[PDB]
Design brief:
Distance between the termini of chain A: 10 Å
Largest sheet of chain A: none
Bound molecules: calcium ion
Pfam families (chain B): Rop (PF01815)
Number of domains of chain A: 1
InterPro entries (chain B): Regulatory_Rop, Rop-like_sf
Protein name (chain B): Regulatory protein rop
Number of helices of chain A: 2
CATH architecture of chain A: Orthogonal Bundle
Strand content of chain A: under 5%
Shape of chain A: elongated
CATH class of chain A: Mainly Alpha
Oligomer: homodimer
GO molecular function, one term (chain B): identical protein binding
Number of strands of chain A: 0
Radius of gyration of chain A: 13 Å
Keywords (chain B): Plasmid, Transcription, Transcription regulation
């Protein structure tokens, strides 16, 4: 089902940006713990995005 | 199957990291970061169900 493939690929991609929008608001508030996790999420989502692009 | 494990396990982990950020945001009272964290949790859960369906 490409429907599932599209969700996986489009969401993983969109989460990367969302993660960065958080990382930016975090650094403003100097919220360093939130900042670190947001980076991590950005990095996990990118991995999902790469894995998907390839597999599908 | 390497991509599958990655797509599956990371979409699930992100879902957890999204809620961890939601709590810290709530404590610090960061409403914006809090709404986005929710969203990310929700989008990660979608990648998770879709992969679960696609790979299962
Ligand atoms: Ca990184
Ligand atoms: Ca890249």
């Amino acid at each position: 089902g490409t429907k599932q493939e599209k969700t996986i690929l489009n969401m993983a991609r969109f989460i990367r940006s969302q993660a960065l929008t958080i990382l930016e608001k975090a650094n403003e508030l100097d919220a360093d713990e939130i900042a670190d996790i947001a980076e991590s999420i950005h990095d996990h989502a990118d991995e999902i995005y790469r894995s998907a692009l390839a597999r599908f």
